[PDB]
């Protein structure tokens, strides 16, 4: 038997900022306990007879299938609903007529607002263009904790288009608010820096906790050697676009200067910014990261729906 | 435990006209009994190991998801089959190779004929262009009965394009044949009246039962005040199309003259003919109507497949 | 309870050539034992909590739905994954993060190679353009055995575009390698003969077993009368295309010369090469063939995943 994280009971999950550090600790432990259980071949039937409907206005097969698999590995059911129109509100009401939990993926933050304005069952926000992707943030935290043993104390590099990558903005805010980080490296090509508004947002936390923040335009052996986590992201189309790829690339040559105890992570999909020539390195955690996503989403759904 | 409606055992459900009043009474009671059970958190596993395949040649996510959710809340399984060609008959045979029940949605009444000409398992007709939508008719009846306590005795207004709305033709025929209605108001813009052939069809029943039939081109305070059910439908594109909307619109101003004990219904989707400014009124039943659809479809599937 | 075919445990199923005659015998018996069980109304729950993900880059609703239904009738779960790009390898890794078994349908044999190069769970090959369609071959063998009582000893006609029909190449290789056939008729229009390389491939087996091989450009009463199986396939677009259809057509007139104890088979879909005027003939086995496909795929999945 598992103990649900009681603060999530019957609650929509809109932003990772709605959780305390204690909530996150509890979700991490529950996800790991389920991982041990499931990987031992034992099953979970607690959500038998409960129905999830995903409503995905943009394709994200990676995130969608994880939510669906999480629901089914708890014994629950999943009903598809093809987006076909009528108002989004009326569509949500249609889902509520037969569902226990909704999973919404829409680029507009307004859509989540509108959905929650009428929904009678919990909505899981599966990601939007405002950078609120609560289960990605939480699975990223779980991955660090499970791979290294702790999140407190780490040096982490956030690597990519930090200007436009609003999901990484949210990840930084969550990490700085909840964990005693040692250092955050912000690695981005010239002109794609983390926005000043985000640094202002975390300033209270960074100064209370004494977290070092360092901006640079590329990786160096010294930065790599200092990091416990290299967190890479995809650069999507500046006149130095192709030329800047070499300074962010993580490959076998780059990992020559890395610690023995560190991980490389990436929310995926990747293009060329993460070479396949480290895919078999024990520190390459970005595939296991997806499996941590399965168990974090099980921990969340179990806690939301257990009664 | 639940008692199946025995007359449905192993039978395709092609038209609501195939049921007696006793069948409808029994399906209503079974749907309500399942509603109490399910909403108490209890589950149903009777159809474990049975397979439904929906075959939808036109999109209707509202009707499709209801059938799928109904099947899964009975413990059954659902297999998708994307329409890709080969004959419809060969496709049906393909579904029968592994399914226990088929759900067919096709605009042509010929398609249901062809499917039943070769099918070896029951087919649930999910709606066609001839107006045969048996589970919509039955869920509409359940909604009235559950919301008001009875269908016998009601005055109901059917509002919209009554000329082309063949599904409403079927609803009127079913109501007049099986229930002691007091009165039916037929509210339609000029030129979109209920066809004379439909009034001729119900004439035997209307005269045996003494049902009043009244045609009008718009709602009035007197008609509204007299009705137990306002059943609205969508007007799809006459030179007075936009101008006629005001005479059919149901909004807060219109409900000022309505009874305390009445409901507004709509099979959905709606555009503007049903204002959001009554969506929180207790008499607005068109969202609960969809949940009655879930339990009516469970009652039907349970009765068809229980052995 | 059922005994799994132990040689399949935890193994990807890439080609029917990976099985011994003993494996095939065992899979046939297991499929038939499951058929009796399931058709008696008894259920199977052995794979409760196990997840299948199909990844279909080409449409084949017939093969896809059979795999999904097989999984669910063993108690297992199915998660869809819409092909959306990222490498196929990264997509496979994504499926492995939450799945127990993958089902791959891709036209390129290279795709199966690439998938197996990184997959950590078994992959079921659902068919490719190299003619490797292991569950079609195995269900075809099961159909013959179940319908006639044995595969050893038969005369079979393979009818269609034998040049380009690479799946039929594989079927011939499998039959000649594993069964004491009496005779294979190769019926194909001029220029569409079975390739010489395939006859060279089976030569060792045909001479050890004494199997007769006979090429002809059309069916005749003498060939029809001699066959235990007429295995027809679809001709897809030579200046004699339409004209050659009459010499391959199987209809009621053609079956006038057939044995009482024989079957007509076809992997499906068909166009006109198999008339509907034999669809009710007891020897028309091509619809039952699909149901044998369900139980063969259950036997396979059960054996792959039982632990």
UniProtKB/TrEMBL annotation, chains A, B, C:
Highest taxon of source: Eukaryota
Function: Catalyzes the condensation of carbamoyl phosphate and aspartate to form carbamoyl aspartate and inorganic phosphate, the committed step in the de novo pyrimidine nucleotide biosynthesis pathway.
Transferase is among the record's keywords: yes
Protein name: aspartate carbamoyltransferase
Record flagged with keyword Coiled coil: no
One example of a Gene Ontology biological process annotation: 'de novo' pyrimidine nucleobase biosynthetic process
Pathway: Pyrimidine metabolism; UMP biosynthesis via de novo pathway; (S)-dihydroorotate from bicarbonate: step 2/3
EC code: 2.1.3.2
InterPro entries according to UniProt: ACT_dom (IPR002912), Asp/Orn_carbamoyltranf_P-bd (IPR006132), Asp/Orn_carbamoylTrfase (IPR006130), Asp/Orn_carbamoylTrfase_sf (IPR036901), Asp_carbamoyltransf (IPR002082), Asp_carbamoyltransf_Asp/Orn-bd (IPR006131)
Keywords: Pyrimidine biosynthesis, Transferase
ACT domain segment(s): 52-126
GO annotations of cellular component type: ciliary plasm; cytoplasm; glycosome; nuclear lumen
Catalytic activity: carbamoyl phosphate + L-aspartate = N-carbamoyl-L-aspartate + phosphate + H(+)
GO molecular function, a single term: amino acid binding
Family: Belongs to the aspartate/ornithine carbamoyltransferase superfamily. ATCase family.
């Amino acid at each position: 038997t598992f103990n649900p994280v009681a603060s999530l009971k019957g609650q929509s999950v809109a932003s990772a900022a709605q959780f305390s550090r204690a909530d996150i600790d509890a979700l991490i432990q529950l996800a790991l306990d389920m991982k041990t259980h499931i990987e031992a071949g034992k099953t979970i039937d607690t959500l038998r007879g409960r129905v999830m409907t995903p409503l995905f206005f943009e394709d994200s097969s990676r995130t969608l299938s994880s939510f669906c698999a999480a629901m089914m590995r708890l014994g629950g059911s999943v009903v598809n609903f093809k987006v076909e129109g009528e108002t989004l509100q009326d569509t949500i009401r249609t889902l509520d007529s037969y569902s226990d939990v909704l999973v919404l993926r829409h680029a507009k933050e307004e859509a989540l607002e509108q959905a929650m304005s009428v929904a009678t069952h919990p909505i899981m926000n599966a990601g939007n263009g405002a950078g609120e992707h609560p289960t990605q943030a939480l699975l990223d935290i779980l991955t660090i904790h499970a791979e290294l043993g702790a999140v407190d104390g780490i040096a982490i590099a956030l690597i990519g288009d930090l200007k436009k990558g609003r999901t990484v903005h949210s990840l930084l805010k969550l990490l700085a608010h909840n964990f005693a980080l040692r250092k955050v490296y912000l690695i981005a090509p010239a002109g794609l820096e983390m926005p000043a508004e985000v640094l202002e947002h975390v300033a209270t936390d960074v100064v209370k906790r004494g977290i070092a923040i360092q901006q640079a335009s590329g990786l160096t052996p010294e930065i790599v050697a200092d990091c416990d986590v290299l967190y890479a992201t995809r650069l999507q189309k500046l006149t130095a676009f192709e030329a800047s790829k070499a300074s962010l690339l993580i490959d076998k040559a780059r990992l020559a200067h890395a610690k023995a105890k560190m991980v490389v992570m990436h929310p995926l999909p990747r293009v060329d910014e993460l070479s396949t020539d480290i895919d078999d390195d024990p520190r390459a955690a970005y595939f296991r990261q997806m499996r941590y996503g399965l168990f974090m989403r099980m921990a969340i759904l179990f806690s939301v729906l257990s009664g």
